[PDB]
């Protein structure tokens, strides 16, 4: 039969295309298929009753509008309860919640506040009297709070003022330049209070306490590591910060044995002198030797379009190799976080691949370069895909037009992470796993995709091969517990 022969050739063709996607080799137990069919049901319900009933597919909307919807979906609770592996792309000063800074930090002593000339609130700590500036009229948060009338209103205005999701960012800061302006204001509002050593040591623990409470067991954080200041005025160095994080991490691992651990990546800004960037590469070289397991490598952060390139820093980033004997400072570069093509920003991909990076951040413009894409696969370089950030920071509006979706469908080395979840009031990793589930994979791909993501966060991490084996075991143990309790609570008895 001509129809029968056609349908056989068609099914072979489609199944040969779908056999090359990410997670196509995950074989699920019948118990795991129960969860898979619960997720695929709601996924297909929203996909199909939005395609045919001709309505908006809320999972792909602005996170201001989708968050309330996502927080009422039965699948988001499954992901909330899922051991997601590791979050491999984080920035320290925005990986915990603003409510802790409003409720804990701004209730401490010696906390002043002021409204800058842009009508934004700023916070700082000064134990040496009133703060020394007059572009701002600093007042004590303690007194200004009591003299209001409704303390909760004072503490809600504080959060609304320093959050980016108090208004729809795609409407309040419509241009990429504007949203990066509000994004930069966010950090300047909090710098005077997050770099005080007592507040920072407690803030970092809040990161670990929250990321485990979202069933994430491993984190690789990027930090400036220097500038922690005390009440007496003393400002510390970088090695102080690394050991402050190392002390909190080990107290945590001892307290919670289900956690895998944390590791640190030093970050420098893209707009600072080549002299300082070499100075920081030197700090990373020594810190990597002194702390071989807690310290991973170096990265340059900050807005990628209007600031410098990776070639502008070649004398520094090649310094570890010209040494005799040659040294290896591992790199974790941001690269190609742009819509531009065949430009400096787009071409930072080649420099990162030739500087032998271990993972690439964002990598939005990798698909635009055929050979660059092939080479990264051959060498094993994985891309850290951060979906929600790529929407708010203005690389795409509909997440379904993400530039790495084609790569996911060809089993490309990829992991999923957030970037600065606390700025836009997002969950540690659940909200970004959900967006990938509904916007970055197909209608016939739910749990094979998610499980491969968790496994790739361990395979393409910076742990030793010995650690990675011992890390998957802990994740496996918690994963089977997650399948067991979920299926027990859904399947009839």
Ligand X SMILES: *[C@@]1(O)O[C@H](CO)[C@@H](O)[C@H](O)[C@H]1NC(C)=O
Among 10, 290, 328, 481, binds a copy of itself (CB under 8 A): 10
Using the contact rule CB under 8 A, the part of the chain among 126-134, 172-180, 257-265, 476-484 near a copy of itself is 172-180
Q: CA–CA distance from 349 to each of 62, 221, 223, 301, 369 (Å)?
A: 28, 22, 22, 14, 9
Indicate the angle between helix axes 176-194 and 197-213, nearest 10 degrees. 120
Among 186, 196, 288, 362, which one carries the catalytic annotation? 362
What is the distance between the alpha carbons of residues 121 and 118, in angstroms, rounded to a whole number?
9
Using the contact rule CB under 8 A, the part of the chain among 27-35, 217-225, 341-349, 454-462 near a copy of itself is 341-349
Whether 337 is catalytic is yes
How many of the other CB atoms lie within 10 Å of CB of 237?
12
Among 150, 230, 444, 488, binds a copy of itself (CB under 8 A): 444
Among 280, 304, 337, 425, which one carries the catalytic annotation? 337
Using the contact rule CB under 8 A, the part of the chain among 9-17, 253-261, 416-424, 467-475 near a copy of itself is 9-17
**Position of tokens 């804990």?**
104
299 is a site residue for Zn ion (CB under 5 A):
no
Task: Please state the closest distance from residue 399 (CB atom) to a copy of itself, in A.
Answer: 9
Q: Which does 347 bind (CB under 5 to 8 A by kind): ligand X, a copy of itself, Zn ion, none?
A: a copy of itself
Structure tokens at 281: 């590469």
419 is in an annotated binding site: yes
Task: Please state the closest distance from residue 270 (CB atom) to Zn ion, in A.
Answer: 11
Whether 196 is catalytic is no
First-residue to last-residue Cα distance in the chain: 46
Q: Which does 189 bind (CB under 5 to 8 A by kind): Zn ion, ligand X, a copy of itself, none?
A: none
Q: Tell me which residues in 349-388 interact with a copy of itself (CB under 8 A).
A: 350-351, 353-354, 367-372, 375
Please name which of 327, 380, 315, 326 lies closest in space to residue 353, comparing C-alpha atoms: 380
The answer, yes or no, to whether the previous bond of 373 is cis (omega within 30 of 0) is no
Helix (H) / strand (E) element for 392: namely helix 387-392
45 is a site residue for a copy of itself (CB under 8 A):
no
Q: Which does 42 bind (CB under 5 to 8 A by kind): ligand X, Zn ion, a copy of itself, none?
A: none
Q: Which does 351 bind (CB under 5 to 8 A by kind): Zn ion, a copy of itself, ligand X, none?
A: a copy of itself
What is the distance between the alpha carbons of residues 37 and 321, in angstroms, rounded to a whole number?
51
266 is a site residue for a copy of itself (CB under 8 A):
no
Using alpha carbons only, give the angle 442, 68, 106 rounded to the nearest 5 degrees: 125
* Cβ proximity to a copy of itself, 4 vs 152, nearer residue: 4
Contacts of 433 (CB under 8 A, 6+ apart): 79, 82, 84, 416, 450, 453
What 241-250 contacts at long range (C-beta under 8 Å, 24+ apart), as own/partner pairs, is: 242/287, 242/291, 242/294, 242/295, 244/197, 244/200, 244/201, 244/204, 245/204, 245/221, 245/294, 246/291, 246/294, 248/201, 248/204, 248/205, 248/208, 249/208, 249/294
Site string for Zn ion, 185-224 (x = CB under 5 A): ----------------------------------------
How many of the other CB atoms lie within 10 Å of CB of 29?
9
Q: Which does 328 bind (CB under 5 to 8 A by kind): a copy of itself, ligand X, Zn ion, none?
A: ligand X
* Burial call 374-383: b when 16+ CB within 10 Å, e when fewer: eebeeeebbb
- Which residues are designated catalytic? 337, 362
Binding site members for Zn(2+): 89, 91, 334, 419
Footprint of a copy of itself on this chain (CB under 8 A)? 2-3, 6, 9-10, 13-14, 16-18, 20, 47-48, 51-52, 54-56, 60, 175-177, 305-306, 314-315, 318, 321-322, 339-343, 345-347, 350-351, 353-354, 367-372, 375, 395-398, 400-401, 403, 405-406, 409-410, 441-445
Binding site residues, Zn ion, CB under 5 A? 419
């Amino acid at each position: 039969t001509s129809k029968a022969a056609y349908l056989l050739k068609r099914n072979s063709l489609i199944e040969e295309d779908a056999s090359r996607k990410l997670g196509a080799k995950i074989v699920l137990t019948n118990e795991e298929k129960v969860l898979d069919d619960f997720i695929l049901a709601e996924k297909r319900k929203l996909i199909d009753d939005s395609r045919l009933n001709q309505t908006e597919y809320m999972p792909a909307a602005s996170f201001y509008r989708s968050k309330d919807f996502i927080d009422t979906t039965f699948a988001y609770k499954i992901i909330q309860d899922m051991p997601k592996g590791g979050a491999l792309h984080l920035h320290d000063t925005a990986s915990a919640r603003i409510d802790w800074i409003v409720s804990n930090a701004t209730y401490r002593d010696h906390v002043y506040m002021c409204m800058d000339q842009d009508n934004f609130v700023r916070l700082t700590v000064s134990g040496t009297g009133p703060p020394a500036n007059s572009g701002c009229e600093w007042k004590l948060v303690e007194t200004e709070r009591a003299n209001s009338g409704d303390i909760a209103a004072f503490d809600h205005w504080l959060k609304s003022n320093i959050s980016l999701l108090t208004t729809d960012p795609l409407v309040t800061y419509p241009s990429l330049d504007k949203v990066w302006g509000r994004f930069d204001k966010h950090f300047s509002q909090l710098r005077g209070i997050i770099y005080h050593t007592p507040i920072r040591r407690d803030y970092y623990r809040q990161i670990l306490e929250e990321f485990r409470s979202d069933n994430v067991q491993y984190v690789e954080v990027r930090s400036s590591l220097s500038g922690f200041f005390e009440l007496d005025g003393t400002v510390h160095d970088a090695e102080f910060g690394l050991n402050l994080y190392k002390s909190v991490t080990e107290e945590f691992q001892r307290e919670y044995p289900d956690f895998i651990g944390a590791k640190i990546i030093l970050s420098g800004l893209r707009f600072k002198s080549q002299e300082e960037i070499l100075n920081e590469v030197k700090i990373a070289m020594d810190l990597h030797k002194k702390y071989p397991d807690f310290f991973l490598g170096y990265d340059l952060v900050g807005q990628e379009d209007p600031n410098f390139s990776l070639l502008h820093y070649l004398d520094a980033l090649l310094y570890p190799s010209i040494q005799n004997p040659p040294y290896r400072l591992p790199y974790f570069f941001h690269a190609a976080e742009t819509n531009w093509q065949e430009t400096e920003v787009d071409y930072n991909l080649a420099d990162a691949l030739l500087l032998n990076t271990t993972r690439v951040g964002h990598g939005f413009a990798l698909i635009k370069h055929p050979r660059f894409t092939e080479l990264a696969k051959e060498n094993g370089v994985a891309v850290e895909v951060n979906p929600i950030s790529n929407q708010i920071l203005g690389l795409v509006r509909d997440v379904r037009n993400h530039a790495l979706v084609p790569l996911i469908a060809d089993d490309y080395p990829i992991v999923i992470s957030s970037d600065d979840p606390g700025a836009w009031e997002a969950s540690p990793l659940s909200h970004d796993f959900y967006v990938a589930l509904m916007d970055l994979c197909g209608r016939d791909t739910a749990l094979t995709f998610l499980k491969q993501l968790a496994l790739n966060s361990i395979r393409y991490s910076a742990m030793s091969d010995t650690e990675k084996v011992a890390a998957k075991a802990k994740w496996t143990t918690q994963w089977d517990k997650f399948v067991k309790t979920s299926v027990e609570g859904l399947k009839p008895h």
